[PDB]
Amino acid sequence: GITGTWYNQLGSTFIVTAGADGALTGTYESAVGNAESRYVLTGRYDSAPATDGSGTALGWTVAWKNNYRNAHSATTWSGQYVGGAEARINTQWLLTSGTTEANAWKSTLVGHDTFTKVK
Amino acid sequence: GITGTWYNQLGSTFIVTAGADGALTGTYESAVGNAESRYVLTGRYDSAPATDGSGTALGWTVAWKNNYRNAHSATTWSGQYVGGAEARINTQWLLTSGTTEANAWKSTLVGHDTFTKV
Amino acid sequence: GITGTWYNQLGSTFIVTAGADGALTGTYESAVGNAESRYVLTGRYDSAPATDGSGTALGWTVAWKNNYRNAHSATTWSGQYVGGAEARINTQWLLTSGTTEANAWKSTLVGHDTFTKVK
Amino acid sequence: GITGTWYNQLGSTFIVTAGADGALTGTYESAVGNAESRYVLTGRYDSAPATDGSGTALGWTVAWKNNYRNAHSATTWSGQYVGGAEARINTQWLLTSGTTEANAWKSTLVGHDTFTKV
Ligand SMILES: O=C(O)CCCCCNC(=O)CCCC[C@@H]1SC[C@@H]2NC(=O)N[C@@H]21
Ligand SMILES: O=C(O)CCCCCNC(=O)CCCC[C@@H]1SC[C@@H]2NC(=O)N[C@@H]21
Ligand SMILES: O=C(O)CCCCCNC(=O)CCCC[C@@H]1SC[C@@H]2NC(=O)N[C@@H]21
Ligand SMILES: O=C(O)CCCCCNC(=O)CCCC[C@@H]1SC[C@@H]2NC(=O)N[C@@H]21
């Protein structure tokens, strides 16, 4: 159910393929920030979820560098997939920028994104 | 400089290989929590950091399931690599557990880990 | 505009009074967790906001101990007030529990709450 | 044990008084960021921690505005006090800046600070 095209509240696009071994691979296109075009993403997910009523834990990373731009930063999203008629991935994320050692204290942003599956 | 064996402050070991295009691949062994043996890890890093003096942005994920246990959770570390004599990777992490909807508010833990090659 | 009664998506209630010196004082009643009745809250807010189109930065803390229960934990909410016809306080929070030194790594939860002002 | 003068790893000084019912009052002086002089701080702490061996839960807020500057932001630290010979306060913090709606996604920074009386 994870595999497919998803969009978040900002208009960003997340295209992912879930592998049988727990691997997530795909491309991400961000509606905001210092980004252009597609960026490679790689992640992991729990391929043997609990079967009560719980979500599937997962996470993925994107380094903001492709052939067109490099923002010297990486974002990791951690959250869970909640399947159903209306599938959603609720996340919390951390965006770290490469900084000198003096600005290190302000290298990391934190937010939350909710993704909606197309079709 | 990233490629290698790293250890954090809790006793975990992180073995990673950094590929030429920004890929991070390896295995993780946790010292705490519901965990036993190695777990596969994957991530990405800036394979062209700035030349000022800044660290190298990176991140990776470890889903806590292997052929022995499944804690139904995944951790993502976000931080930066800083080279030099005493190379370090400073990160902050988010641990999300699969939960029912009524427990989603307390699904995520947050912490910080410092990795060194010592 | 901050002063008043607010509710979040979980059904929790936040009654606050904003002082002229940047102080926030009031009571909080949580719909979830190890809590019962009212808990004292104290915080600070930027009493001289930018006047472009931006929110007002603020934060407050609640220690989960009152005369009825003690959860040995404290939550701090950090966010901004966005006034208007439909006033909202968008937050991110950290809940830390007192732990032994060995469980310290798992002492802190992180989430996000959106509050809606009544009337 | 909480009452006193504390310092973090960046050079900031935290002067607090802990009241009998759980109130935290004091002043903060930052060593980094847009900041100059002391800022008022208020918080709460568990005024009846458990007797096992656990730390004391606490939190406080500092709005970054005083009679000299206004960074239009507020930081909240959440963590715990651990007594003993080398008393420490370990925390994680969230720094939110007032933003326009189109910049709300990047309104909040997150970090961790360790305070000692040294
Ligand atoms: O590098 C700094 O110091 C930060 C500068 C401000 C933002 C610049 N942009 C970037 O670094 C890359 C864009 C990241 C986009 C973010 S990741 C979390 C959030 N979700 C989403 O779909 N888009 C945003
Ligand atoms: O504390 C508990 O066990 C209940 C809370 C839910 C978490 C359950 N999941 C786990 O314990 C999975 C293993 C995570 C261990 C973490 S990842 C962040 C930190 N760094 C490290 O090297 N080990 C710990
Ligand atoms: O103490 C632990 O180890 C955690 C145990 C699980 C939760 C127990 N509950 C508590 O500690 C106190 C309840 C806090 C309520 C939280 S604060 C953040 C969130 N917002 C809101 O309106 N309610 C919840
Ligand atoms: O890096 C910048 O200045 C742009 C990012 C927005 C933040 C603007 N606000 C400030 O700098 C206000 C002062 C915060 C300083 C922080 S609070 C967390 C950390 N601990 C400490 O003792 N000082 C720093």
Tab-separated table of N, CA, C and O in Angstrom, chain A residues 37-75:
chain	number	residue	atom	x	y	z
A	37	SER	N	13.637	20.360	-9.306
A	37	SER	CA	13.539	19.049	-9.922
A	37	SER	C	13.479	17.908	-8.906
A	37	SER	O	13.059	18.094	-7.756
A	38	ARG	N	13.910	16.725	-9.339
A	38	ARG	CA	13.859	15.524	-8.518
A	38	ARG	C	15.125	15.184	-7.741
A	38	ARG	O	16.235	15.403	-8.220
A	39	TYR	N	14.933	14.635	-6.550
A	39	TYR	CA	16.040	14.198	-5.693
A	39	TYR	C	15.802	12.751	-5.306
A	39	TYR	O	14.656	12.345	-5.055
A	40	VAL	N	16.879	11.978	-5.257
A	40	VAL	CA	16.802	10.579	-4.904
A	40	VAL	C	16.461	10.444	-3.424
A	40	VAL	O	16.907	11.237	-2.604
A	41	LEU	N	15.643	9.463	-3.095
A	41	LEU	CA	15.327	9.211	-1.692
A	41	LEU	C	15.543	7.731	-1.433
A	41	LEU	O	15.434	6.906	-2.337
A	42	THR	N	15.894	7.413	-0.196
A	42	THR	CA	16.103	6.036	0.183
A	42	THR	C	15.617	5.939	1.631
A	42	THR	O	15.762	6.869	2.420
A	43	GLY	N	14.996	4.821	1.954
A	43	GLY	CA	14.474	4.647	3.293
A	43	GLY	C	14.260	3.200	3.628
A	43	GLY	O	14.665	2.312	2.882
A	44	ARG	N	13.620	2.976	4.769
A	44	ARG	CA	13.316	1.645	5.271
A	44	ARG	C	11.911	1.693	5.894
A	44	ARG	O	11.461	2.748	6.353
A	45	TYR	N	11.222	0.553	5.896
A	45	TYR	CA	9.909	0.474	6.510
A	45	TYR	C	9.769	-0.907	7.126
A	45	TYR	O	10.484	-1.840	6.762
A	46	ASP	N	8.852	-1.019	8.070
A	46	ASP	CA	8.617	-2.271	8.757
A	46	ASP	C	7.772	-3.109	7.816
A	46	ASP	O	6.576	-2.836	7.629
A	47	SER	N	8.411	-4.112	7.220
A	47	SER	CA	7.731	-4.977	6.266
A	47	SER	C	6.853	-6.075	6.852
A	47	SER	O	6.327	-6.898	6.106
A	48	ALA	N	6.676	-6.075	8.173
A	48	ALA	CA	5.838	-7.079	8.851
A	48	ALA	C	5.140	-6.379	10.003
A	48	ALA	O	5.365	-6.703	11.174
A	49	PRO	N	4.270	-5.407	9.678
A	49	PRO	CA	3.507	-4.603	10.642
A	49	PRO	C	2.658	-5.432	11.600
A	49	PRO	O	2.349	-6.596	11.324
A	50	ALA	N	2.301	-4.817	12.726
A	50	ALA	CA	1.451	-5.438	13.717
A	50	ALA	C	0.131	-5.491	12.986
A	50	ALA	O	-0.113	-4.696	12.078
A	51	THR	N	-0.750	-6.401	13.354
A	51	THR	CA	-2.007	-6.429	12.617
A	51	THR	C	-3.184	-6.168	13.496
A	51	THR	O	-4.199	-6.858	13.383
A	52	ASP	N	-3.040	-5.196	14.392
A	52	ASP	CA	-4.130	-4.818	15.285
A	52	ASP	C	-4.880	-3.708	14.562
A	52	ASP	O	-5.820	-3.962	13.801
A	53	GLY	N	-4.467	-2.470	14.770
A	53	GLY	CA	-5.121	-1.379	14.055
A	53	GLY	C	-4.072	-0.300	13.814
A	53	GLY	O	-4.380	0.831	13.425
A	54	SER	N	-2.823	-0.683	14.023
A	54	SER	CA	-1.688	0.226	13.915
A	54	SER	C	-1.050	0.527	12.569
A	54	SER	O	-1.138	-0.238	11.604
A	55	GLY	N	-0.357	1.661	12.540
A	55	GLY	CA	0.314	2.080	11.344
A	55	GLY	C	1.619	1.344	11.139
A	55	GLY	O	2.074	0.585	12.000
A	56	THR	N	2.222	1.575	9.977
A	56	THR	CA	3.469	0.929	9.638
A	56	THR	C	4.570	1.970	9.749
A	56	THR	O	4.537	3.003	9.066
A	57	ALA	N	5.525	1.699	10.627
A	57	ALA	CA	6.634	2.607	10.853
A	57	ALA	C	7.570	2.669	9.652
A	57	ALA	O	7.861	1.654	9.018
A	58	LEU	N	8.026	3.870	9.334
A	58	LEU	CA	8.945	4.050	8.234
A	58	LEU	C	9.688	5.364	8.314
A	58	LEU	O	9.374	6.247	9.126
A	59	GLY	N	10.686	5.480	7.458
A	59	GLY	CA	11.470	6.687	7.436
A	59	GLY	C	12.269	6.728	6.161
A	59	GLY	O	12.534	5.698	5.515
A	60	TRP	N	12.615	7.925	5.751
A	60	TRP	CA	13.407	8.043	4.559
A	60	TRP	C	14.199	9.318	4.625
A	60	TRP	O	13.909	10.212	5.415
A	61	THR	N	15.215	9.376	3.789
A	61	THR	CA	16.098	10.519	3.741
A	61	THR	C	16.214	11.034	2.313
A	61	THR	O	16.087	10.273	1.362
A	62	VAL	N	16.487	12.325	2.195
A	62	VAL	CA	16.740	12.961	0.919
A	62	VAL	C	17.914	13.928	1.163
A	62	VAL	O	17.884	14.701	2.119
A	63	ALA	N	18.959	13.846	0.344
A	63	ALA	CA	20.079	14.798	0.460
A	63	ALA	C	19.743	15.779	-0.670
A	63	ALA	O	19.556	15.379	-1.818
A	64	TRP	N	19.641	17.058	-0.335
A	64	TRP	CA	19.261	18.060	-1.325
A	64	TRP	C	20.312	18.415	-2.389
A	64	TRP	O	20.689	19.574	-2.571
A	65	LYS	N	20.770	17.398	-3.104
A	65	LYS	CA	21.731	17.597	-4.163
A	65	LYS	C	21.358	16.702	-5.323
A	65	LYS	O	21.174	15.508	-5.146
A	66	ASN	N	21.206	17.282	-6.504
A	66	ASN	CA	20.940	16.492	-7.689
A	66	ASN	C	21.852	17.142	-8.726
A	66	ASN	O	22.763	17.893	-8.353
A	67	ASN	N	21.654	16.856	-10.004
A	67	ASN	CA	22.505	17.449	-11.038
A	67	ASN	C	22.265	18.946	-11.240
A	67	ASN	O	23.062	19.641	-11.866
A	68	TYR	N	21.164	19.462	-10.716
A	68	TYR	CA	20.873	20.870	-10.916
A	68	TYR	C	21.202	21.807	-9.757
A	68	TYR	O	21.560	22.956	-9.968
A	69	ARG	N	21.105	21.320	-8.529
A	69	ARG	CA	21.367	22.206	-7.413
A	69	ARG	C	21.878	21.417	-6.221
A	69	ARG	O	21.738	20.204	-6.174
A	70	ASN	N	22.489	22.122	-5.273
A	70	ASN	CA	22.991	21.516	-4.058
A	70	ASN	C	22.763	22.502	-2.911
A	70	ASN	O	23.404	23.557	-2.842
A	71	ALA	N	21.853	22.142	-2.011
A	71	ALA	CA	21.535	22.987	-0.881
A	71	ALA	C	22.354	22.646	0.374
A	71	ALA	O	22.098	23.216	1.418
A	72	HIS	N	23.305	21.715	0.260
A	72	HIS	CA	24.148	21.291	1.380
A	72	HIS	C	23.296	21.030	2.610
A	72	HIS	O	23.500	21.628	3.675
A	73	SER	N	22.334	20.131	2.456
A	73	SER	CA	21.425	19.815	3.548
A	73	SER	C	20.700	18.511	3.271
A	73	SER	O	20.575	18.085	2.122
A	74	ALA	N	20.199	17.896	4.331
A	74	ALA	CA	19.507	16.636	4.198
A	74	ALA	C	18.313	16.611	5.131
A	74	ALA	O	18.362	17.145	6.235
A	75	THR	N	17.238	15.993	4.673
A	75	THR	CA	16.034	15.887	5.474
A	75	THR	C	15.711	14.420	5.684
A	75	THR	O	15.885	13.589	4.786
